[PDB]
């Protein structure tokens, strides 16, 4: 039974693979079927951030699996007006809502109350099944 | 004494004014000093936010006091890259920091800890003595 351990920075062979949510990419240690086929456990230190593209490796180095942010039910906000988005970011952080931030776009786990709070800013909120990479801050 | 009890939606020619910082402007019941030296007691409806430009009057409609946001010690954050400002807003709100948000310009009570924290994000912080008007949520 192969078990993942250390996390390298160097993006080696993408021959192996695994796809997990944000929920599990902060467990440091767990197990479920993978993408390369070969099931495997986990051995990562405390308080680690696993990002889409972040390669992993074992003690032997024979394998270099890759972590992939699985699609997750999220609310997506797209606007080309930084101000309207800035305001939003403020109020979401004020409720400690894990949020993904990119130019012209925001992502947070689907929640209608939040969608209505954002629509109250004249923002368009649409549902999506996409990878969720919220801001570093657990 | 003199009591200001209403905030007329309808403007009017001001007969006086009182300068006040945000902490006071959130206070419904309080004794203040008009800029002409007279003492007036604010007795407006509870839970109301006084903004600069607000005009308070009395029952008899014989006094129209204009609220002026007092100059406060604030840090000012800018960046030609608007996307950089957003992340700062998210973190500031995470810490529940009163914040004034304008297009390409943030403002908050000067605090050196927050300043460094924002420089990390690579934001240039500046200082000013300006009227502070934080978001109300």
Tab-separated table of C-alpha atoms in Angstrom:
chain	number	residue	atom	x	y	z
A	1	UNK	CA	0.000	0.000	0.000
A	2	UNK	CA	1.653	3.190	-1.265
A	3	UNK	CA	1.463	6.226	1.045
A	4	UNK	CA	2.232	9.855	0.153
A	5	UNK	CA	4.476	11.891	2.445
A	6	UNK	CA	6.663	14.937	1.713
A	7	UNK	CA	5.462	17.773	-0.532
A	8	UNK	CA	8.005	19.041	-3.066
A	9	UNK	CA	8.033	22.394	-4.846
A	10	UNK	CA	9.530	21.011	-8.051
A	11	UNK	CA	6.707	19.894	-10.409
A	12	UNK	CA	8.087	16.491	-11.439
A	13	UNK	CA	6.411	13.611	-13.285
A	14	UNK	CA	2.652	14.094	-13.479
A	15	UNK	CA	2.441	10.327	-14.015
A	16	UNK	CA	0.439	9.937	-10.801
A	17	UNK	CA	-2.581	11.958	-9.650
A	18	UNK	CA	-5.223	12.693	-7.021
A	19	UNK	CA	-8.178	15.104	-6.946
A	20	UNK	CA	-9.503	16.515	-3.672
A	21	UNK	CA	-11.596	19.490	-2.419
A	22	UNK	CA	-10.421	22.322	-0.171
A	23	UNK	CA	-12.085	20.547	2.754
A	24	UNK	CA	-9.653	17.615	2.597
A	25	UNK	CA	-6.583	19.526	1.359
A	26	UNK	CA	-6.021	20.697	4.936
A	27	UNK	CA	-6.146	17.329	6.708
A	28	UNK	CA	-2.410	16.676	6.269
A	29	UNK	CA	-3.158	12.934	6.475
A	30	UNK	CA	-5.976	10.793	5.018
A	31	UNK	CA	-6.809	8.184	2.342
A	32	UNK	CA	-9.175	7.673	-0.618
A	33	UNK	CA	-8.821	6.298	-4.162
A	34	UNK	CA	-6.603	8.342	-6.478
A	35	UNK	CA	-6.388	9.212	-10.186
A	36	UNK	CA	-3.317	7.220	-11.215
A	37	UNK	CA	-5.417	4.322	-9.960
A	38	UNK	CA	-3.219	3.289	-7.042
A	39	UNK	CA	-4.974	4.111	-3.759
A	40	UNK	CA	-2.854	5.845	-1.096
A	41	UNK	CA	-2.781	7.443	2.360
A	42	UNK	CA	-1.255	10.744	3.486
A	43	UNK	CA	1.676	12.053	5.534
A	44	UNK	CA	1.850	15.856	5.637
A	45	UNK	CA	2.849	18.192	8.523
A	46	UNK	CA	0.362	20.370	10.419
A	47	UNK	CA	-1.149	23.529	8.928
A	48	UNK	CA	-0.335	22.904	5.263
A	49	UNK	CA	-1.920	24.471	2.190
A	50	UNK	CA	-2.331	22.081	-0.731
A	51	UNK	CA	-2.701	23.997	-4.007
A	52	UNK	CA	-3.765	22.825	-7.448
A	53	UNK	CA	-0.457	21.924	-9.048
A	54	UNK	CA	1.336	21.143	-5.792
A	55	UNK	CA	3.303	17.921	-6.275
A	56	UNK	CA	3.809	15.287	-3.570
A	57	UNK	CA	6.397	12.544	-3.086
A	58	UNK	CA	7.373	9.604	-0.867
A	59	UNK	CA	10.590	8.593	0.909
A	60	UNK	CA	11.840	6.668	-2.136
A	61	UNK	CA	10.929	9.386	-4.637
A	62	UNK	CA	9.742	6.724	-7.097
A	63	UNK	CA	6.454	8.592	-7.503
A	64	UNK	CA	5.407	12.238	-7.871
A	65	UNK	CA	1.621	12.453	-7.514
A	66	UNK	CA	-0.212	15.707	-8.129
A	67	UNK	CA	-2.964	17.408	-6.146
A	68	UNK	CA	-5.913	18.731	-8.146
A	69	UNK	CA	-8.636	20.945	-6.730
A	70	UNK	CA	-11.827	19.023	-7.405
A	71	UNK	CA	-14.858	20.968	-8.599
A	72	UNK	CA	-17.014	22.164	-5.722
A	73	UNK	CA	-20.434	23.799	-5.494
A	74	UNK	CA	-19.574	27.479	-5.447
A	75	UNK	CA	-21.102	30.897	-5.990
A	76	UNK	CA	-19.205	32.905	-8.558
A	77	UNK	CA	-19.193	36.650	-8.869
A	78	UNK	CA	-17.896	38.276	-12.044
A	79	UNK	CA	-17.666	42.023	-12.531
A	80	UNK	CA	-15.168	44.319	-14.258
A	81	UNK	CA	-15.665	46.950	-11.560
A	82	UNK	CA	-13.004	46.543	-8.804
A	83	UNK	CA	-14.913	48.847	-6.492
A	84	UNK	CA	-18.071	46.722	-6.411
A	85	UNK	CA	-15.902	43.677	-5.828
A	86	UNK	CA	-13.836	45.393	-3.140
A	87	UNK	CA	-16.956	46.224	-1.196
A	88	UNK	CA	-18.040	42.590	-1.446
A	89	UNK	CA	-14.703	41.220	-0.292
A	90	UNK	CA	-14.993	43.400	2.816
A	91	UNK	CA	-18.385	42.132	3.918
A	92	UNK	CA	-17.564	38.482	3.241
A	93	UNK	CA	-14.378	38.672	5.253
A	94	UNK	CA	-16.418	40.338	7.982
A	95	UNK	CA	-18.327	37.056	8.290
A	96	UNK	CA	-15.174	34.962	7.944
A	97	UNK	CA	-16.388	33.384	4.733
A	98	UNK	CA	-13.607	31.387	2.993
A	99	UNK	CA	-13.277	33.212	-0.341
A	100	UNK	CA	-11.340	32.801	-3.600
A	101	UNK	CA	-10.118	36.061	-5.123
A	102	UNK	CA	-9.019	36.722	-8.709
A	103	UNK	CA	-9.201	39.803	-10.932
A	104	UNK	CA	-12.811	40.347	-11.927
A	105	UNK	CA	-13.889	37.216	-10.052
A	106	UNK	CA	-14.790	35.870	-6.592
A	107	UNK	CA	-15.668	32.358	-5.387
A	108	UNK	CA	-17.147	31.099	-2.085
A	109	UNK	CA	-19.144	27.962	-1.155
A	110	UNK	CA	-22.707	28.290	-2.451
A	111	UNK	CA	-24.960	30.104	0.040
A	112	UNK	CA	-28.054	31.990	-1.095
A	113	UNK	CA	-28.220	34.405	1.839
A	114	UNK	CA	-24.741	35.494	0.822
A	115	UNK	CA	-25.834	35.674	-2.802
A	116	UNK	CA	-28.661	37.986	-1.841
A	117	UNK	CA	-26.339	40.070	0.274
A	118	UNK	CA	-24.148	40.471	-2.793
A	119	UNK	CA	-27.066	41.071	-5.157
A	120	UNK	CA	-27.903	43.946	-2.838
A	121	UNK	CA	-24.724	45.530	-4.251
A	122	UNK	CA	-25.975	45.197	-7.805
A	123	UNK	CA	-23.677	42.222	-8.423
A	124	UNK	CA	-24.434	39.151	-10.524
A	125	UNK	CA	-24.051	35.866	-8.671
A	126	UNK	CA	-24.128	32.654	-10.672
A	127	UNK	CA	-23.801	29.014	-9.565
A	128	UNK	CA	-20.934	26.784	-10.643
A	129	UNK	CA	-19.168	23.435	-10.236
A	130	UNK	CA	-15.546	24.565	-10.119
A	131	UNK	CA	-12.268	24.128	-8.182
A	132	UNK	CA	-12.173	26.225	-4.973
A	133	UNK	CA	-8.865	27.886	-4.016
A	134	UNK	CA	-9.783	30.352	-1.237
A	135	UNK	CA	-7.368	32.922	0.195
A	136	UNK	CA	-4.634	31.581	2.453
A	137	UNK	CA	-6.047	32.087	5.926
A	138	UNK	CA	-7.286	29.164	8.021
B	1	UNK	CA	-31.074	73.969	26.344
B	2	UNK	CA	-31.114	73.403	22.579
B	3	UNK	CA	-32.226	69.968	21.344
B	4	UNK	CA	-31.656	68.534	17.864
B	5	UNK	CA	-34.253	65.821	17.344
B	6	UNK	CA	-34.757	65.465	13.594
B	7	UNK	CA	-32.734	64.783	10.473
B	8	UNK	CA	-34.814	66.333	7.720
B	9	UNK	CA	-34.726	64.358	4.514
B	10	UNK	CA	-35.440	67.722	2.941
B	11	UNK	CA	-32.384	69.991	2.974
B	12	UNK	CA	-32.526	73.532	4.367
B	13	UNK	CA	-30.203	76.498	4.799
B	14	UNK	CA	-27.990	75.684	7.777
B	15	UNK	CA	-27.900	78.094	10.703
B	16	UNK	CA	-24.905	76.396	12.347
B	17	UNK	CA	-22.683	73.313	12.389
B	18	UNK	CA	-20.974	70.783	14.674
B	19	UNK	CA	-17.787	68.865	13.796
B	20	UNK	CA	-17.663	65.286	15.058
B	21	UNK	CA	-15.585	62.088	14.748
B	22	UNK	CA	-17.227	58.804	13.738
B	23	UNK	CA	-17.378	57.439	17.310
B	24	UNK	CA	-19.638	60.352	18.219
B	25	UNK	CA	-21.547	60.300	14.955
B	26	UNK	CA	-22.809	56.804	15.881
B	27	UNK	CA	-24.206	58.193	19.155
B	28	UNK	CA	-27.910	59.079	19.198
B	29	UNK	CA	-28.038	60.680	22.643
B	30	UNK	CA	-25.129	62.973	23.562
B	31	UNK	CA	-24.086	66.484	24.530
B	32	UNK	CA	-22.124	68.286	21.802
B	33	UNK	CA	-20.752	71.776	21.206
B	34	UNK	CA	-21.783	73.629	18.051
B	35	UNK	CA	-18.997	75.494	16.271
B	36	UNK	CA	-20.473	78.789	17.481
B	37	UNK	CA	-19.902	77.731	21.064
B	38	UNK	CA	-23.460	76.851	22.020
B	39	UNK	CA	-24.254	73.584	23.764
B	40	UNK	CA	-26.769	71.338	22.044
B	41	UNK	CA	-27.963	67.917	23.031
B	42	UNK	CA	-28.389	65.364	20.253
B	43	UNK	CA	-31.598	63.421	20.817
B	44	UNK	CA	-32.236	61.826	17.433
B	45	UNK	CA	-33.935	58.456	16.952
B	46	UNK	CA	-31.793	55.628	18.378
B	47	UNK	CA	-29.501	53.648	16.080
B	48	UNK	CA	-28.954	56.249	13.373
B	49	UNK	CA	-25.635	57.129	11.718
B	50	UNK	CA	-24.732	60.818	11.343
B	51	UNK	CA	-22.824	61.437	8.116
B	52	UNK	CA	-21.101	64.596	6.993
B	53	UNK	CA	-23.674	66.730	5.251
B	54	UNK	CA	-26.503	65.588	7.518
B	55	UNK	CA	-28.584	68.530	8.749
B	56	UNK	CA	-30.141	68.227	12.190
B	57	UNK	CA	-32.942	70.476	13.427
B	58	UNK	CA	-35.206	71.038	16.407
B	59	UNK	CA	-38.933	70.512	16.884
B	60	UNK	CA	-39.750	74.181	16.234
B	61	UNK	CA	-37.671	74.067	13.046
B	62	UNK	CA	-35.650	77.082	14.112
B	63	UNK	CA	-32.191	75.538	14.004
B	64	UNK	CA	-30.567	73.661	11.135
B	65	UNK	CA	-27.239	72.201	12.230
B	66	UNK	CA	-24.907	70.753	9.624
B	67	UNK	CA	-22.781	67.768	10.588
B	68	UNK	CA	-19.164	67.906	9.484
B	69	UNK	CA	-17.040	64.770	9.766
B	70	UNK	CA	-14.125	65.763	12.008
B	71	UNK	CA	-10.573	65.240	10.696
B	72	UNK	CA	-9.281	61.901	11.976
B	73	UNK	CA	-5.866	60.222	12.037
B	74	UNK	CA	-6.114	57.715	9.239
B	75	UNK	CA	-3.935	55.485	7.155
B	76	UNK	CA	-4.646	55.738	3.429
B	77	UNK	CA	-4.105	52.795	1.088
B	78	UNK	CA	-3.817	53.048	-2.678
B	79	UNK	CA	-2.479	50.981	-5.563
B	80	UNK	CA	-2.830	51.430	-9.321
B	81	UNK	CA	-3.771	47.742	-9.317
B	82	UNK	CA	-7.418	47.642	-8.092
B	83	UNK	CA	-7.249	43.859	-7.697
B	84	UNK	CA	-4.626	44.402	-5.003
B	85	UNK	CA	-7.034	46.601	-3.005
B	86	UNK	CA	-9.699	43.888	-2.863
B	87	UNK	CA	-7.559	41.312	-1.068
B	88	UNK	CA	-6.768	44.009	1.479
B	89	UNK	CA	-10.463	44.615	1.984
B	90	UNK	CA	-11.103	40.945	2.563
B	91	UNK	CA	-8.445	40.733	5.251
B	92	UNK	CA	-9.321	44.031	6.920
B	93	UNK	CA	-12.928	42.911	7.164
B	94	UNK	CA	-11.716	39.611	8.540
B	95	UNK	CA	-10.422	41.556	11.517
B	96	UNK	CA	-13.626	43.673	11.598
B	97	UNK	CA	-11.742	46.899	10.892
B	98	UNK	CA	-13.936	49.970	10.346
B	99	UNK	CA	-13.073	50.903	6.775
B	100	UNK	CA	-13.957	53.620	4.259
B	101	UNK	CA	-13.943	52.172	0.767
B	102	UNK	CA	-13.654	54.427	-2.264
B	103	UNK	CA	-12.620	53.647	-5.868
B	104	UNK	CA	-8.890	53.044	-5.632
B	105	UNK	CA	-8.604	54.305	-2.043
B	106	UNK	CA	-8.999	52.773	1.428
B	107	UNK	CA	-9.022	54.573	4.746
B	108	UNK	CA	-8.966	53.486	8.421
B	109	UNK	CA	-7.964	54.675	11.898
B	110	UNK	CA	-4.182	54.692	11.960
B	111	UNK	CA	-2.826	51.439	13.379
B	112	UNK	CA	0.761	50.478	12.619
B	113	UNK	CA	0.117	46.738	12.797
B	114	UNK	CA	-2.371	46.942	9.946
B	115	UNK	CA	0.042	49.093	7.965
B	116	UNK	CA	2.811	46.464	7.904
B	117	UNK	CA	0.269	43.739	7.266
B	118	UNK	CA	-0.849	45.639	4.155
B	119	UNK	CA	2.700	46.357	2.999
B	120	UNK	CA	3.194	42.611	2.927
B	121	UNK	CA	0.453	42.495	0.291
B	122	UNK	CA	2.812	45.014	-1.285
B	123	UNK	CA	0.629	48.049	-0.631
B	124	UNK	CA	2.006	51.530	-0.017
B	125	UNK	CA	0.428	53.060	3.079
B	126	UNK	CA	0.243	56.837	3.546
B	127	UNK	CA	-0.975	59.171	6.323
B	128	UNK	CA	-3.521	61.955	6.459
B	129	UNK	CA	-5.865	63.842	8.773
B	130	UNK	CA	-9.156	63.427	6.998
B	131	UNK	CA	-12.890	62.966	7.665
B	132	UNK	CA	-13.362	59.229	8.303
B	133	UNK	CA	-16.497	57.566	6.874
B	134	UNK	CA	-16.406	53.740	7.329
B	135	UNK	CA	-18.809	51.368	5.591
B	136	UNK	CA	-22.011	50.594	7.461
B	137	UNK	CA	-22.515	47.091	6.143
